[PDB]
Each structure stands twice: as C-alpha cells, then as structure tokens.
Symmetry: C6
Subunit: 323 residues, 6 copies
C-alpha cells in the first residue's frame, strides 16, 4: 500500500513541499536557534536588531542579532513572503501590511510591516510556541496547582470524577496561562473507550490514553464552526474544542442544549462569571442568535456548564466554579 | 404497465445506476464486512488503518485492516469521490475537504480530508447505520423501558392512549438513544385508518399497520421545510417528522398553532425542559420568527406539546413529561 | 356583442384551451371516476397502485388500479407535466420534484416525485375537492351544528344578527372541517343590497342572495395581498376572505384598524385563543409589522374581531367566542 | 403672454392631449351617462352587463347595459388600456391584470381582469366620484351633523374656534363617510390671510375663502411624502393633507413634533382611539421610525393631535375627541 | 498675489460665472423688485399671476403681475431651469417636477411644476429670504423679547453669562420665528478670543466680534454631518450649528457626550420638552444609533443641553428652560 | 546588512521620497516658521491672510502673512494637493472639497475648500501639533496636577501603584487637555520587563523605560480595530491604545471581558460617568454588539475599568474615579 500511497501523494506532496522548503530554510535561518530553546512560549522581533523570547517562567530574554545576515531587511522579507504564500496569502506594504500565518511545523506567526510599524526598517514578527509537552495531572498537583483553593480536595476530586462522568468543563485564563496544558493532563480521566474528536487551530492536543479518536483543524476557508459542525456528524463521545472562538460560540450553546456528553474547552476569560458573559457575547455575534435575548444566553450557559477552572498568570488555579 | 414503466425509467435508471454502481463496489469493497454486522450503530475510520465499530450495547470495537487493499490512500479516495458525485457534490483537499453524503442504500456518511485531518495520510470516514429493525412496543415494556419511571402504568397507558387520540408527542435524547426506534413501535396505537405522512432524511420509518400513507425525503436542493410544507398540502391525519431540525423548527410551531392533529417527532434534547428551549431556539432562527418574543415561543411550545419522552444513554425512559 | 366578444377572446382562448385540453384528457383519464364521486373531500395517490379517497364522513376508501393504463409511470408523468405547464410551472426529478398546481376545473393538486418520494416508481398525487354544494343555514341547525354549545340560542341568534350588522367574524378549525361551507350558508343574513367582494384561491363561494358583487382570485404572480389591496379599492360593503393566509395577515389588521364593516374569513386554528395567536404570528411575518410589538398585535386583533366560531373534526361548533 | 404661453405649452399639450382624447371618448362612450348622475359616490361594473351606481344616500342602483356596444369585451378593453397608458401603466391578462389609474378629469379607477376576475369575460371596473360640491358649515349644522353629540354646542364652537387658532385636527371615518366634505366646509374658519398648502391625490379641496394658497398632487413617481416634504419648504400657514396615507405617516409626526401650526387631515379610522393606533402603525412602517418604541408613537400622537372628529356611515358626527 | 490668484481662479470663475449670469438676469428679471423689499421673509408664486410676499410683521402682501413678460410660462421655465443647472440638478414635468435649489446670492428656492401643481399653467415658486440684518442683543431686550417670562432678569442674565461660559444652548421655534437672528445677537457674549466654526446651509451668521473663525457650508454631495465631522477636526472653541437637521442629529449627541464646550444651535421645535423629543427622533434615524434605547437618547440630551430658548410666532421668548 | 538594506529599501524609498519631498518644501514654505514655534498645539489658516496659532497656555495668537508668496491661492493649492497625494487621496472643488491627511512628519491636517468654505478664495487649513515632549510624572505633581483633588495622596499613589499592577485606566477630557502627555509620564510605573504594544494614529508615545515593545499605526486602508486585533496576536503585557475611537470601541470591551492585563487609553469624555456612556455608545456602533443590551454595556465597562482620570481645560485633574 505504501508504494501506491506514495505515488498517490506524490503530486500534492511535491506542490506542498515546494512551498514548505523555502519556508523551512528561512525559518531555520532566522529563528532556528530560538525555536530550539526549551520552555519558551513566544519569540518576538521588533525590527530593532534584537530578538525577545518569553520563557515559561514569564521572563523576557533579549538576544542581540546586530551581526547576523538572517536579519537583513531583505532576508526578513523573504521569510515574511514565505509565510504568506505558505498559507496562501500575500504580504506587502500597501493593502496587506499585517499578516497572520504559520511556520512549517504549525506555530502561529504574526507579521507586521510599514506603514503599520513605526518606519520602513521595522519588521515586527511574533511567533507563538504551542504546547509541546504533556505533564501528568499528578505533576500539576505536585506543583501545587490547586493550592490557592480552599476546596482543595473537593476540587482535585471534582475534576477527576467530573470529567470521568462527562461533565462540560471550561478551562479559562489569560494567554499562555497553561490552559491547554491543563486540559491535556486531565484527559487521563476519560474512559479509554471514549471516541474523542478535537477541534484545534494548531496540533497541540495529544492522545496518550485514547486509541479511538480524530483530530480536526480549521484555518483559511474552513472555519472553526465547520469543524464543530462536522464533529457532530462523526459520532463523538467527547468533544475537545481547542478554544471557544466566536464562530463555534453559538453552535456550542445549541450543542449544550441538546444535552451533549463530555465537552471540554479552553477560553480567554478572567474568571467564572466573566466566562459566562464571554460566552453570551460570542454567541450573540452569530446571526442565528439574532432573536435570542442576551440575558437569556448567560442564563443558558449557566445551566449547561458544569464546572469552570480559571488559572492566574502564575499558572495556578485561583477559582474552581462548580454546578 | 411494467413493460412501459421500464422503458420509461430506463433513462433515469441508467444515469443513476451509472453513478451508484461505482459507489456500490467501493462501499462493498471497503466497509462491506462491517455493514453486514448485526446491532451496530456507527462505522468510523480514523485513517490509521483501524476500523472502529460502535455496537448497540454502546461498546466500541476496533478491527485491524493494515493488510487490506481497500484501505489504500487511493482506494479510499476513489470511494470518497464516489460519495461526493453520488449526491452531486465534490470532495478535494482545498475548498471541499469536508463532505457529507450517503451510501448506495441511504446511510449518512461523513468524510474528512487534509488539511482538515491531522495529515495527508489521514482520511476520516464516519458511517451511521439507520434504524433497520422494528421491535413491537411490548418488546420495549419487557426490556423495562418505563422501569425508571415512578408513573410506570400511567406512562405506559398515556403513550398508548394519547397517541391513539392524536396528541403531539416528542421523543428526545442523545444520538443513538433509540428514539427513531421508540416512535416506530408506538405507531401501533394509531388507528389503521389514519393517513400518515413522514418527513425523513433516511428511510427508517416502516409502516407495519398502515396502508394509507406516504413518505417524504429531504436532501440537497429540497429542504426539510419543503417537505413539511408539501406535507400540509397532502391531507395528513398524522405527521411523523423524522426529527425536528431547524428549518421545520418554526413551521412546526405554526402547525401546532393551527391545532393540528397527531404529531410525533424525535429531537436532540437532554430533557423536557430542554426540548422546550431547544424548540424556541430553532424557531427563532427562522426569519418569520424575527418579530416574535423568544420567551413567547417557549410558552408557545409549552401549550401545544402534549407529552415528551426522554431516553438516557442506556436506552431507557428517564422522563415522561405530560400535559 | 357575443360575435365580437368571441373573435376578441379567440386568441387567448386558443392559447389557454391548447394547454387545458391535454390536461383535461389526462385528468379525465386518471382521476375521472373518482372526481365523479359524491361527498368526497380528497383524492390521494401514493404511487402504489391504489387510489385513496377521503369521504365527507371522514372515512378513507381505497381503490385498486393495478390493472389500469392511466396509472403507468409514463401515463402518470404526462398528467403531472400537464399540471405544471397549466399553471406555468415545471415538474421534474431534479430541481422541481415537488409541485403545486390545479386541474382544469380549479381543484388544488399536490404532486411529489423522486428523489422526494421513497423511490423512482412512486408518484404521489393529492387532489383537494373544493366546497361544491351550498346547504342553507337551517340545514346546519337541523344537523345540530350548535348542539355542543350551551349558549345554543344565543349563538344561533348571534351569528344571524351579528352578520346582519356587519361584525367581523372568523370561522376556524382543521382542514375540511366545513368552515367554507359554514360561511357560505350564513351569507344568507347579509342584506341583499350589500356589494360583496371575495378573495379566493379556488372559486368556492357562491352568491345566492347577492346581485351586486365581485370575485377575486390570487395565484402565481398575483398574491393574496394584491387581491385584498385591490379589494379595498373596489368599494366593498362586505369582504369575504376565503382564508387568511399570511400575506393578507397584516394588511387584514390595518383593515380592521380603519374600522371596516363586515369581514368574514376562515382560518386554520384550533380555537378562539389560538386564532388570536395565529393572527399575530402571520402579521409579524410582514415587514410592515417589523416595528410593532407582538403582544401588541394579539391585543389588537382581540379588540377588532367581533366573534369567532370554531368547528371540531366532526363538523360541529364547539366554541362560539363573542365580543 | 398667452400667445407665447400657448406656443410654449404646445408640445406638452399635444402629447398629453394625444393620450387624453382616446380616453375621453372611451370614458364618455361607456360611463358617460353615469358620470352625469348627481349625488353618486361610486360607479362599479362587475363584467356581467350591469352597472351598479352607489348614491350619496348609501343606496346601490343597478342599470342594465345588455344592449350597448360600449360594453363589449373589446370596447371595454380599449377603455381599459386607455386608462393604463394615460397614467403610463400597462394592463394585460398576465403580469398586469390588476390596474389603478384615473379618468380624464381625475377620478380614481380600479380595473381587474382575468385571471384575477372569475372568468375571461369578466372585466371589473370601479370608479370613485370625488367630492365635487361644497356645502357651507352651516349646512352641516342644519342637517344635524352634531346632533348625536351631547356636547353639541361645545363641539360646534370647538371646531369653529379651534380651527381659527390653528389646532391640529383629524377627521376620520369610513369610505365616503363625508370627511373630505366636512373639512372643506370648516375651512371657512381659517383666517383668509393664511397661506394654505394642500396635498391631494385628486383635486377635491376648493379654496373659497383663501387667495394665497397652492395645491400639491402625488401619483406615480411622486409620492405623498414628497409633496409634504416640499410643502414644508413652501412656507405654509396651514397644511391640508388630503388624507394620511402611510408615507406621510411618520413625516407627519415629526411635523407635529416641531410644533407646526394648523394641520387638518382626513383618515380611515373607526374612532378617536382607533385613529391614534392607526397613526402609530403607519409611522412604524417608515424606516426612520425603526428605532422608536411603538407605544411611544401613540403617546406621541396623543400629545400633538388637538381634536378628532369621527363620522359614522350615516354622515353624522358620533365622536368629538378634544384635547 | 492677486494677479496670480486671478489667473488661478480664472478657470473656475469662468465656469461658475457662465451659469450664474443666466440665473442672475432671470432672477433680476422676475423677482428683482421683490428681493429689493425690506423686512420680508418669503416670496411665493402660485402660478396664478400674483406674487405673494410675507413681511417680518407676519403679513402677506399680494402683488399683481398679470402684465409682465417675466411671468410667461416660458420666461418662468427659463428661470426654473437656471435654478436646477446652477445647483447641478434637473427640473422637468416627468421625473423631476419638484425642485430645491438656490439663487445667485444664496436664498433657498422651492419650485414645483405639473403634474404636481394643479395644472400645466401653474408654476409654484417659493423663495426663503435669509437673515440679512444683525440687531444687537440690547435691541431684543428693548423690543421686549424676554417680557413674557417671569424669570425676566434671571433669563436675560442666564443667556449672557451662560453663553460666556460656553454652555450648550438651543434656540427653537417655528419657521421665521427669529431664531437665527436671536443666536446672532447673543454671540456678543462669547469671548472674542474663541475660535468659532459654523455649519450653515446659507451664509447667514455674521462674525462682528470674532476675528478667529471659519464658516462651513453643506449642500449637494457634501452633507451636514460632513461639515460637523470636519468641524471637530478644525479645533473649534465654539460650534454654531445653523440648525440641527437629522444627519448631525446623532453626531451632535456624541459631541455632547465627549463634553464639548460652547454649542449653540437653532431647531424646529414647539418647546423645550418638544426639542428633547425632537432630538431623540433625529438621532434614532442614524444607523449608529440602531442599538441605543430611544428613551435613552432623550435622557441623554436632557443631561447635556444646558439651556433652551423657545420663540413664539410673535417673535418673543415664551419659554426659557435651564439646567 | 545596511548595504543590502539600502538597496532593498531603494525602490520603496524612491517612490515615497518622490511624493514626500514635494510636500516637505510646500510644508516648509508655508507653515515652516510656525511649526518651529515651541509649546503650540494647533496651526490654523482661515484663508484670510492670517495664521492663527494656539499655544499650550490656551491662547490664540494671529500672525499676518498678507505679504508672503507661500499664501497665494495657487501656492496654497499646491501644498493642499501635496497633502492629498501623500496619503493617496484627492482634493478638489467638487466631490473632494474636504480633506484629512498628514504632513511629512505625521501631524494631522484638515483642509477645506470651496464650495464648503465661504468663497473661492478661502482655503481653510487646520494643523494639529502632536505631543512632542515628555515631562516626568513628578513634573505633573509639581505643577499641581492632583491639586484640585481632595484624595490628593490617595490619587497620586493609586495611579502609581495601580498602573504598576496593570489596572485598566482611562485618561479622558477635552482636546489638547494633556491626556496623551499624562499617560506618557505615568508609564514610568510599568515594570520595565513588560512587553508593550501601542496603537496610535500619529507617533506620539515614547518608550523611555521599556526596551521590549512595538508600535502600531492605523490609517487609510488599515483600521484602528485592525491594529488592536493584530495587537492581541503579538503577546502584549500592556496595551496602550492611543485613544478609543469607535472601531476598537467594542473589541476593547471583549478584551476587557477576557480579563486582560494593563490597559491604558485616552478618550474624549467630559467625565467618569460620561466616559462610561461614551464607551457603551461606541461599542453599540459595532454590528457584533447588535444583540447586546445598551444598558448592559455600560454596566459591562463599569465592572472592567479600574480607574478613570479626567482633566479640565486648565490641564488639571478634576476627577479621579477608582474601583
Ligand atoms: N504547570 C506547568 N508547569 C510548567 N510549565 C507549564 C505548566 N502549565 C503550562 N506550562 C507551559 O505553558 C506553555 C503552554 O501554555 P498553554 O497552556 O498553551 O497556554 P495558553 O494559556 O493556553 O495560551 P493560548 O493563548 O490559550 S493559545 C508551555 O510552554 C508549557 O510548558
Ligand atoms: N354540515 C355539513 N354536512 C355534510 N357535509 C358537510 C358539512 N359542512 C361541510 N361539509 C362537507 O365538507 C366539504 C367542504 O369542507 P370545507 O368547508 O371546504 O373544509 P375546510 O375545512 O374549509 O378546508 P380548507 O383546508 O379550509 S380548504 C364538502 O365536501 C362538504 O359537502
Ligand atoms: N426681534 C426682531 N425684530 C424684527 N424683525 C426680526 C426680529 N427677529 C427676527 N426678525 C426678522 O426675521 C427674519 C429672520 O428670521 P430667522 O431668525 O431666520 O427665522 P427662522 O425662524 O430662523 O427660520 P428657519 O426656518 O429657521 S430658516 C428677518 O427678516 C428678520 O429681520
Ligand atoms: Mg491553548
Ligand atoms: Mg375552505
Ligand atoms: Mg434660521
């Protein structure tokens, strides 16, 4: 089969690998060193000859590249273009000065050029390093994840038992707060017989205890809602929504209204009460919600969401909303 | 007549059977074995050389196909395309990566390709086996369908008598909860003289006790609402709506408002109170509902729906809402 | 004049009669026998070689046509097409599988073909036999039409006197409940000097006691609202709206708001309270109602509608709402 | 000047009078006799060889024309077309079966043809005779116009004094109730120095006591609102709105909100409370009202309208709302 | 500079002065005499050979022009056309029968032709004479402008002091009530150092005590809102809005919400409470107000507007709302 | 790298500097002298040969240019066009009479021409001088910035501590009130380790204590929201929004709802309570807010905004809203 599968992939691979190699060398050439760094969460470039790296410990570390070819207005632009074309987009100094794309391996990239940056020699790049490690839940308890909670044992058991029964759980907090990481470890408590479907933007979730599953990715023409909609047609036992965005927003409510099993998703929210408002908002953006009272959605999400876990900027649970 | 009916069908049959045969062999070739399995509810493929089958008893069973030609990226793609073309759709790795269609006999098929699947060697297929059996109502009582209810006799008699008088009844619950099945058996209690019209997506309902009837199917160009709208022009005594979707949603409310006889339909809802909300939601999606207060619909459905029956994941009634 | 009127009609008649004859023979050929049957209300065909006829007494009678040429897939399709073209529409197995048209004499026809019907040999036809008889009001009293009412004399006199004074009256109930028939007999109590205008879909109303009048028909490009709008420009004393549909819905409210005389109309509603909701709904569908509070319409119709009469499935008044 | 005015009008006159003459002879030819009848309010034809005329005393009088050439399907059609073309419209038996236009002198005409009329030999015409006489107010008092009122003197003086001060007054009631007439007589009490602007559909208002004035007519391209909008740019002391229609509806509210002087208009409403609702409705039809609470308009009109006078079907004031 | 400025203006001037001269002679030719008349406010023509002039004292004076060439259907039309073309518009007897334009000097003109006027010999013209005089505030006190007020000294001082501090003041009343005139005199109390920007339709405001200022005019493609929007970009100390219209309506609210200094504007409103409603209305017409509660605007304007002055038809303050 | 960076910029620089030089000389030629003046805030020209300059101390100073070539209708127009073309816009006396652009260095320019200005010799220019200086916070305390406050120490410490913790703070007041300035000094209290992203319209913010940062500019094709949206993808610790405009308005609410760190922005509002209303308004302009109750936004912003500081026209804090 592989002999035929290869000849069958040949055409697409050639095409893809004819746009992914130029980008691979450029990436390698510029941010290669930094990408090798362990425990980092972001790599930024403020077109000022210095590369700023954000570490898991929340510390920004600057690096000097004054004397490097890979950081020439031209060498930079070539990498920029490599990013646009990869995701089939264009990047220039007129109509498309701002850009959003990805690297060869999947990391999100944010590129900005003049006239949007302060001058014509400033090229702003911002790469987001996904969750590339899986620590067991126990690891989280050890590091004292539920230490700020007064319902410490109640929480540690709620999460374990709850998820095992298929409650709808939301993990929220700020950027890089460790939400994705957290949901990844608590997956240990989902019966290994459950068919799981995940909707991601970047492959981040890993299935260490589940043979039957399937991953879905949105981006470009295909939308987050498209994945979730397809998801509900693929007979899932558990649906792991990388992170509620805005498209899924409303369709997520309906999925909850049909009394759907184990839902687990991360979201940008500063707390439980906030998450609830956060959801109503995003839902109301969808036309289908047009005729539904706003304060009617919040109550709606408040009946459906079983438990919420919020994580502060110090990667620690500081709120464990239940029921 | 058959001699002319044949020559008259000849042209359409040729055309149809020139797109249905390629699909039949592919189907047969790949999921032939699995489709033959008794008491299954879904057949999934996660493009990882293993076929997962979900049994009626809720158990997932993996089957190895590492050494089968029918599971070659090419052999799989040919079957995929056969599905697209059958329902007159296209499936590719650019604009049409996700697909929804059917098999030669009517079973729903969900196909997903790269870039939506994790890689270019993953082809996700999800086949849903319809309700292909009819157990008498008595069979449900024997298996203790109304055993979790405290109003056990009241329930078993309500359903029987109610339906016989033409009350509006909704059967709700999760996917594969046995709703389609349940309504099919309780049809025994509808006077055999009643002209029945059903709106389905896949032939599933069977008329074992009714000579005068007619089945309607939506899909593609023709919408669920279209069928129901035509239905109301075909002089029905009972209308069996396969399952409230969203188009019919509002038009179903109006049909209830005109005080229509015996309505029976399945719906995705986790309970009685949920079904009510579920309906208001779907109704409000229809423009015609634009000027109608949301909390006005729920009350609306709550006056019209005579009785609701919810089935848990263990195929058992756990709620018997009435009046 | 007739000599010239004939030469003047010649062109249109030729055209019309060149599409109405093909349809006449086909009709005659297939459902000719059944159409001759007295006291029937519907003739259905479930493309299964059996013709089902619904009688006034609410009984379904099957007839075998296994051995009849008029019921050959081809012979059927020819009649089908004859129906489309007549009303200037198309009927096929692709974009136009469902059809709604009429017969040579005016009866509504509902035709459905594959892929909407279960298979390619099933052709569903449903003809609605209009009200083709006029029983005097006295006949209704004799058959005990107001017998279920406790305000028996009050009702029999209300209807008589009310209509004589030009109150707005609505006759509602299910399909074939005898509404049109009822309004037709109670017309006896409208001063013979009143100019009456009727808006129908199929000629059904007959003027036995009124010389000055005019009938209006909607269908195709011309809408129900168009007739009513023209109606209000033809100086009517009484307006008989065959049956409130949805277009007239709102324009009917305004007509009531201008304090218009004797309005009489039939409607699909299961009761008085229902009719009121039924109206608000239909009105809110019209854009012009966009800025009007829904609960504001119901109250609106409740101030305007003088009396409502509902008829159960046994062709008997079971509710006589007044004031 | 007349010598040049003639040569200057020559071109337009020729054109107009080349479409108005054909119509004049047809008119003359058919309804010539009837149009000559004194005290009539409508002339209808139900394409059944009989001409029905409605007299001021509310009596319908039938006239036989069985033996007249002017009533030949052709002779009738020629007159019909003459009406269409006059107002630059088309009338046929397909897309333009219904028609609304006018006669050589301005009377509204409603023409209906098959398929909208019952058959192809029925041509329905409905002519409305405008208010072609002016009876002094005193004449109304003599005929006992304010006789049903208990506030008889208060009413007769309110109208006189009120109007003299420029209050906003509405005259409402049914069709032909004598509203147009009533307002025309009460104009006697408007200081002769007032510049008056009227917005009509058909010249009906006459200025017997006012030298400074100007009449405006809407129809076709030009809308009722257009006239009123131009009106407010022509420095009016009094604005006589023939009859609130729907366009002016909202723009009338704003005109009242700017505290405008003497407004006088007729409206189709069955009473004071009704007129108020009637107004809110029509206002809410205008987009500009989109963001304005419905129950906010009624209160709005209720602050602005100074006094309303309703006339029953017997041409008598039966309600004299004030303040 | 003038030598070059002339050669620089040459092109535009030629063009403008090649359309303004034809209009100058026509104007001069027809309404030349009347325009010379002192203390007039409007000049109307009802195409009946008589010219009606409205004097400041509120008296209408007719003038006979039966024997004047300037009033020939042709001589009139030439002037009419001169008006259209000037403001780059068209005026005819078909699609553009109504017209709005201006004269060589800026006065608003309203022209109406058949079929909108009663006949083909009636040409209605209405010229509005702007405020062409500036009376000192003292002049207003002398003529007893604040004489009907009980808070006579409080009012005379409020206006003086208030405006000096930059409160938001609205002057409202009917047409020609003397609002523009009033605001023009009270400008005396604005510190001469304030940079003032005015948004007018016709130059009317005069700056007698302010060197630093700038006038803005809307008309044609440029809208009232455009001026105000530009205004807020020209660093104004005081903004004099000729008169709130409808475009500025909402943008005026926001300007008040940002806590902007000295706003002074005239408006058509019959009183303080009315002005407040008047504003909410106009604001709600703007899309940007779409999601803002109507009763939320009124309160909004009621917090922002510092003081309102209303003037009756006798050019006298009759309401001095404050705080 | 510089050798290649130059050859790489060469093409864009040539182009830009081929449109920026003409503008530089014109600028220099006309407002060169004024631009050199210290402590000014605006430079206006009212096309009347006098240049008005507004000084920091709020004083308007007139300068005579009667005898200068740079102020010739032509010389002025050339500079005007230079402005249009620079920002790729057009400026003429027909469709583009009003203009908004910038100067060679970034200062906003407002140009107005006839017919919008009073005549064809009036060319109105309004130049706004950005914040080109940075006074330490201490400097503000010395000049008694918090002197009008009663919570003087509480305020001076709130700002210092609050900002250090990353509270959301809004600085509001009138134009040129010193907001841009104020926020710039209080930046001293943001841990130097924070990555800061600013969204400006004109480079004004200066980073004196922050190495890791990036500036964003909107204008033309690129919108304020675009920058903020990109901002949220560039991993910011603090987001300095030049000044809430209207696009960001709603997207700012959501950013607050996700519980985002340190937000600091200036806004046009006359006070705390006003700012709150100001925000709800701007938010409701965005479609995404369509389904969100207005009074729901104000409460929303009132939960999220930590502290507001308002500055009167005398550049002094007069309100210090907290919590
Ligand atoms: N308990 C932990 N101990 C150490 N590092 C951790 C911990 N939890 C998460 N991380 C680190 O945090 C990063 C992953 O953060 P995520 O969980 O993806 O952040 P995030 O908050 O989900 O960001 P977005 O905006 O949602 S994509 C990786 O670098 C991890 O190694
Ligand atoms: N009192 C009666 N006795 C006997 N037959 C009746 C009576 N009233 C009505 N019918 C029969 O009922 C049929 C007419 O029913 P309709 O009055 O048109 O029904 P309908 O309810 O108005 O249907 P739609 O859906 O409104 S078109 C005819 O066959 C009649 O002969
Ligand atoms: N106190 C006054 N005494 C004498 N004439 C006055 C006085 N105030 C105003 N006028 C006259 O009124 C006219 C100006 O009226 P405006 O103040 O422009 O009217 P207006 O009400 O503002 O009209 P619009 O509809 O707003 S354009 C001029 O003819 C003035 O001479
Ligand atoms: Mg994450
Ligand atoms: Mg009927
Ligand atoms: Mg004015």
């Amino acid at each position: 089969l592989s002999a035929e599968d290869k000849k069958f992939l040949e055409v697409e691979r050639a095409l893809k690998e004819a746009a992914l190699n130029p980008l691979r060398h450029a990436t390698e050439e510029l941010f290669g060193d930094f990408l090798k760094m362990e425990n980092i969460t972001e790599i930024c470039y403020n077109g000022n000859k210095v590369v700023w790296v954000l570490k898991n410990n929340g510390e920004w570390q600057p690096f000097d590249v004054r004397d490097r070819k890979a950081f020439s207005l031209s060498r930079l632009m070539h990498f920029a273009r490599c990013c646009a074309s990869f995701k089939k987009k264009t990047i220039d100094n007129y109509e498309n000065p701002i850009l959003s794309s990805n690297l060869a391996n999947g990391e999100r990239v944010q590129i900005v050029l003049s006239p949007v940056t302060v001058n014509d020699e400033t090229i702003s790049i911002s790469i987001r390093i996904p969750s590339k490690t899986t620590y067991p839940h126990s690891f989280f308890e050890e590091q004292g994840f539920y230490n700020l909670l007064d319902n410490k044992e109640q929480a540690i058991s709620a999460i374990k038992d709850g998820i095992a029964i298929g409650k709808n759980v939301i993990v929220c907090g700020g950027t890089g707060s460790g939400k994705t990481t957290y949901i990844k470890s608590i997956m240990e408590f989902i019966p290994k017989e459950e068919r799981i479907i995940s909707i991601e933007d970047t492959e981040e979730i890993v299935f260490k205890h589940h043979k039957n599953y399937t991953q879905l990715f949105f981006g470009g023409n295909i939308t987050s809602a498209d994945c979730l909609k397809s998801c509900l047609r693929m007979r899932p036992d558990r649906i792991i929504l990388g992170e509620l965005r805005s498209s899924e927003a409303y369709d997520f409510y309906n999925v909850l209204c049909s009394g759907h099993k184990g839902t687990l998703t991360t979201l940008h929210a500063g707390s439980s009460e906030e998450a609830f408002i956060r959801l109503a908002n995003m839902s109301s953006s969808n036309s289908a919600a047009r005729n539904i009272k706003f304060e009617s959605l919040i109550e709606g999400f408040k009946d459906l969401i079983d438990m919420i876990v919020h994580i502060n900027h110090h990667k620690q649970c500081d709120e464990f909303y239940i029921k």
